[PDB]
Amino acid sequence: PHVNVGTIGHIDHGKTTLTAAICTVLAKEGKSAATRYDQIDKAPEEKARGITINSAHVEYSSDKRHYAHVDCPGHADYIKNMITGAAQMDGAILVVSATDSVMPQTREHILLARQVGVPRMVVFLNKCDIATDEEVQELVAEEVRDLLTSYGFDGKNTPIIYGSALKALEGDPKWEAKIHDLMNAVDEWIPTPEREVDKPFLLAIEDTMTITGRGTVVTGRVERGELKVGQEIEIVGLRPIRKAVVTGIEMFKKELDSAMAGDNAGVLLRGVDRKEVERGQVLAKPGSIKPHKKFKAEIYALKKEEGGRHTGFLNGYRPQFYFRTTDVTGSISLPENTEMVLPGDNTSITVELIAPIACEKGSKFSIREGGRTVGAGSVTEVLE
Amino acid sequence: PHVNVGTIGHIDHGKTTLTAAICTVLAKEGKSAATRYDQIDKAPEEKARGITINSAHVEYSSDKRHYAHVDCPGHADYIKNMITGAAQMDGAILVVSATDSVMPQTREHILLARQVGVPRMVVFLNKCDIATDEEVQELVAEEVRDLLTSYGFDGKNTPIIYGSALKALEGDPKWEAKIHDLMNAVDEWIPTPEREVDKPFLLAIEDTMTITGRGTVVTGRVERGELKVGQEIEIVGLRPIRKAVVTGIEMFKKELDSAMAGDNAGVLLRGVDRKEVERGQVLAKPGSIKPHKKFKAEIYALKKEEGGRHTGFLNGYRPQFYFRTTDVTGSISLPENTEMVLPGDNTSITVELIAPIACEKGSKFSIREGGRTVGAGSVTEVL
Ligand SMILES: Nc1nc2c(ncn2[C@@H]2O[C@H](COP(=O)(O)OP(=O)(O)O)[C@@H](O)[C@H]2O)c(=O)[nH]1
Ligand SMILES: Nc1nc2c(ncn2[C@@H]2O[C@H](COP(=O)(O)OP(=O)(O)O)[C@@H](O)[C@H]2O)c(=O)[nH]1
Ligand SMILES: [Mg+2]
Ligand SMILES: [Mg+2]
């Protein structure tokens, strides 16, 4: 079980150089492959549910943990990666050039990280081989700390390493030591992710089937947590919420006592009629998630050359919102002074659905029109 | 009195080419000067102190009016120019590429145009030599109209000319004709600006004085309008608003009967004690402007190299707000999810001053910290 991290920050501040520096320094101890800057600086197109992103992925391990590291060419790739959940960062490495201090994309990545629930951050104050004046370095560091605090992060205790990603790539051991310092800070500051099996149980219902005399079997993938026979669940979304007692769990055709995250299982609910359950609802640990018709979210509207809309949309745009296994029609309201959202834009929106869906902070959804995906979103607030 | 216009729109949609095309076509009638694209596109960057705005300037006359036309290279130049007011625009020529449709800077320039008070717009749907197929052009046109309307403009009646800036510049007479259609649209849709001397009188008080035998005399520059001896004015700002009759106007050590925009004049006020006036107040036509402690504004934060802050400021920043002649301390409240404003940024803000200052929509001000200018703003709403 590895830890997911990534290099965020303003363009040309040194994310890719730092990524190559980590891999190069760690490869000398046999803890990574010798990944070169030019392999990562290339924009490697990938596809994650309709959204095309240029994104690089490397792997390395520390003395304590193994890491999966994401790095992206463009600011637009970071927006797309974080909203869709294609990245999923247990912790972020914020690169800030000491010669430029905080820049607009530095703030946007930190805000997006707060909205998609990135727990913690470690800062690499880069280009200190250029900005050698310590008073300059401290002024940038104090600005980064204020920025982290203003967005809910622990600016006082966030580790900030003063280094040079370039000179570390060159083999200068004085600057290589900062790469070691950054790795220890990541080991100690970025928490090990909670296993999906310890989270509140959730299963997205795909099919229903009546077992005459006993109840109704609902089938779907357990997204997180663990369910046990005899436990009580809630059926959330679309229809009025209700509780049910699980009397059976089967996967192939064997009868199992439990189901956990990753399982595609049939769940027998005692006394529930097939008309009470439908696709799009979720089984959930009672009280762990609620139904909502109104929510706030950050969205990315796909460009025309990505299969998205060809023109912008206004207030009152009424598309379909795809949540896990089904779509629900909703109406979109826009923030003040945003009167048109164009293809390629990312913006906050407020959505009033016609039917309630089970959603929380961090729920992912696709915006669809005529069956094609025109945008992707991440729920930031349940507003009901 | 010429009309101030300018090309706005997303980068690479043809603003500079259209600017050169307008002059080149009208120069054939002696109504402008033949202008190549490189004269404006490759002009050098600006090498001075303070806020740095890159902008080119041309002149041309249509059949009915004379025009001063400004064209800027970068998006940041348009933000700075419109917020500070150095690019005062009685009307705008929005350039939109028929190949790319409306882009984020197209919407951004329209929003900024409304906040600084640009009343009207004509649209030059450009690159119709590439995007032949009048159906494709008409779709982009409807998108521009919907965008114009969504931001408070009359998108339904806004003149839209389907042209090609390049082929007009190169002398294609079919496309040259669309330059003349654009001039007709500007002549008829862009309203002639109201004369400065005809606007409601405003004077910004700089100095106050007691002529022991005569009375209180306030001195300042007339921002707009005209003041005549015997008229009633209002003293707006820093004190409860009151009225007073003008009994004297002095300039160049002579008693005069009137003062107008641009004049620096000492104004003698009847029944006003010196403790009732002070720098930062304004004299104004009664009811034309009100004092406010709270307002909304679009501001541009100066970069470090422009003499501004080296670091970003947070919610609750309490700087000075320099209005015409004096600064008033005030607190800044930022829009949602904007927790820090960096040097070089532009953002809408809400301000609460410690004292009421006379202000209105379009009032310009500076943000100052320790005496040095760190930002420039334009009031968008008074509360
Ligand atoms: N002097 C110096 N240059 C650096 C450093 N890190 C990156 N650069 C340079 O800055 C430029 C951008 O770095 P890159 O990693 O591409 O930035 P990214 O866009 O944030 O990935 C490249 O030309 C690097 O060589 C550093 O620590 N010191
Ligand atoms: N084919 C064609 N190209 C154009 C037209 N107008 C502008 N261009 C091209 O678009 C590019 C950018 O135009 P420019 O005037 O610099 O746009 P600006 O950045 O808004 O000022 C230039 O290479 C022009 O040659 C047009 O009507 N037709
Ligand atoms: Mg990079
Ligand atoms: Mg230009």
Distance of CA A69 to the CA centre of its chain: 14
Q: Is A75 a catalytic residue?
A: yes
Residues 298-337 of A with CB under 8 A from B: 311-312, 314-315, 335, 337
Verify that B18 and B55 share a domain, yes or no: yes
Q: Which atom of ligand 2 is nearest to the CA of B10?
A: 20
For B59-73, letters b (16+ CB in 10 Å) and e give ebebeeeebbbbbbb
Q: Which residues pair with A228 in a beta bridge?
A: A258
Q: Which ligand is nearest to the CA of B56?
A: 4
> Which residues contact ligand 1 via a Cβ below 6 A?
A 9, 11-17, 41, 126-127, 129-130, 164-166
- What's the rounded Cα separation, in Å, for the pair B271 and B176? 64
- What are the backbone dihedrals phi and psi of residue A328, each rounded to the nearest 5 degrees, phi first? -135, 130
Question: Residue B128, annotated ligand binder?
Answer: yes
CB-based neighbours (< 5 A) of ligand 3, an ion: A 15-16
CATH number at residue B88: 3.40.50.300
Verify that A70 and A170 share a domain, yes or no: yes
Residue with tokens 């000319």: B161
Verify that B260 and B112 share a domain, yes or no: no
Nearest CA-CA partner of A175 in A10, A34, A14: A14
Contact B353, B291 (CB under 8 A): no
Interhelix angle A75-84/A104-115, nearest 10 degrees:
10
Report CA(B145)–ligand 4 centroid distance (Å): 23
Which token pair is A266? 């049939």
Please give the C-alpha separations between residue A250 and each of A205, A220, A264, A283, B258, in angstroms, as whole numbers: 14, 11, 9, 15, 95
Contact A222, A202 (CB under 8 A): yes
Q: Provide the domain count of chain A.
A: 3
DSSP letters along B335-353, please? PTT--EE-TT-EEEEEEEE
Which token pair is B233? 């004015």
- What's the rounded Cα separation, in Å, for the pair A359 and A244? 20
Verify that B202 and B184 share a domain, yes or no: no
- What are the backbone dihedrals phi and psi of residue B21, each rounded to the nearest 5 degrees, phi first? -70, -40
Verify that A84 and A130 share a domain, yes or no: yes
Verify that B35 and B184 share a domain, yes or no: yes
Nearest CA-CA partner of B320 in B367, B259, B254, B264: B367
Which token pair is A231? 């436990």
Is B151 near chain A, with CB under 8 Å? yes
Q: Is B361 exposed, middle or buried (0-12, 13-18, 19+ CB in 10 A)?
A: middle
Verify that A91 and A219 share a domain, yes or no: no
Across the interface, do B311 and A339 touch by the CB < 8 Å criterion? Answer: no
Which token pair is B54? 């890159």
Contact A209, A275 (CB under 8 A): no
Question: Residue A72, annotated ligand binder?
Answer: yes
The alpha carbon of residue A143 is apart from the nearest alpha carbon of chain B, in Å, by 6
Verify that A79 and A102 share a domain, yes or no: yes
Q: Which residues pair with A68 in a beta bridge?
A: A4, A59
Q: Of B284, B315, B345, which residue constitutes the final position of a domain? A: B284
Contact A171, A195 (CB under 8 A): no
Please report which helix (H) or strand (E) contains residue A213, including its range: none
Q: Tell me chain A's radius of gyration from C-alpha atoms.
A: 23
- What's the rounded Cα separation, in Å, for the pair A316 and A331? 6
Q: Which listed residue (A2, A41, A57, A75) is catalytic? A: A75
Please give the C-alpha separations between residue B41 and each of A217, B14, B58, B278, in angstroms, as whole numbers: 70, 11, 13, 48
DSSP B91: S
Q: Beta strand A91-97 with A3-8: parallel, antiparallel or unpaired?
A: parallel
Is B139 near chain A, with CB under 8 Å? yes
Give residue B347's identity as a one-letter amino acid code.
T
Q: Of B238, B262, B284, which residue constitutes the final position of a domain? A: B284
Verify that A153 and A245 share a domain, yes or no: no
Active site members of B: 12, 15-16, 75
Give residues preceding each break in chain A, C–N over 2.5 A. none
Verify that B73 and B166 share a domain, yes or no: yes
Verify that A96 and A162 share a domain, yes or no: yes
Q: Which domain holds residue B65?
A: 3-189
Distance of CA B342 to the CA centre of its chain: 23
DSSP A372: E
B207 — alpha (psi -120 to 50), left (phi > 0) or beta? beta
> Cα A75–A80–A358 angle (5° rounding)?
145
CATH number at residue B329: 2.40.30.10
Nearest CA-CA partner of B363 in B246, B236, B276, B249: B236
- What's the rounded Cα separation, in Å, for the pair B298 and B113? 11
DSSP B89: -
DSSP A193: P
The alpha carbon of residue B342 is apart from the nearest alpha carbon of chain A, in Å, by 7
Report CA(B126)–ligand 2 centroid distance (Å): 8
Verify that A243 and A157 share a domain, yes or no: no
Residue with tokens 């960062």: A89
Report CA(B362)–ligand 3 centroid distance (Å): 42
- What's the rounded Cα separation, in Å, for the pair B29 and B31? 5
Q: CA neighbours within 13 Å on the CB side: how many for B55?
A: 24
Residues in Cβ contact with B59 at an 8 Å cutoff, skipping those fewer than 6 apart = B2, B32, B33, B66, B67, B68, B69
Q: How was this structure determined?
A: X-ray
- What's the rounded Cα separation, in Å, for the pair A12 and A16? 9
Q: Of A164, A189, A214, which residue constitutes the final position of a domain? A: A189
Residue with tokens 């799009």: A280
